[PDB]
Design a protein around this ligand. Structure first.
Ligand code: OJN
Ligand code: NA
Length: 62
């Protein structure tokens, strides 16, 4: 599915060593700009073992 593709692409991005050391805020605003919802961003962070609360993701984006 395209939601699965968005989340899969996000996961691979969040694993990259250069991206791990980039702040959470920057990565959340960036992934929103790539067309992910807050929920999809949240799922990607959890899948890579860097879980965030959905609240944190929505607070960054708002
Ligand atoms: C905020 O910090 C940053 C932003 C952007 C970059 C630049 N990256 C260049 C290489 C690159 C990038 C992506 C990428 O954006 N992947 C996510 C994605 C999500 C959704 C869909 S839509 C299905 C497509 C893709 N995939 N590649 C190449 C191998 N993965 C982004 C940074 C580079 C270093 C450090 C911090 C960064
Ligand atoms: Na941050």
């Amino acid at each position: 599915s395209e939601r699965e593709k968005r989340v899969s692409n996000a996961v691979e991005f969040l694993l990259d060593s250069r991206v791990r050391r980039t702040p959470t805020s920057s990565k959340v605003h960036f992934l929103k700009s790539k067309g992910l919802s807050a929920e999809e961003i949240c799922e990607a962070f959890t899948k890579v073992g860097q879980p965030k609360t959905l609240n944190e993701i929505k607070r960054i984006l708002s």
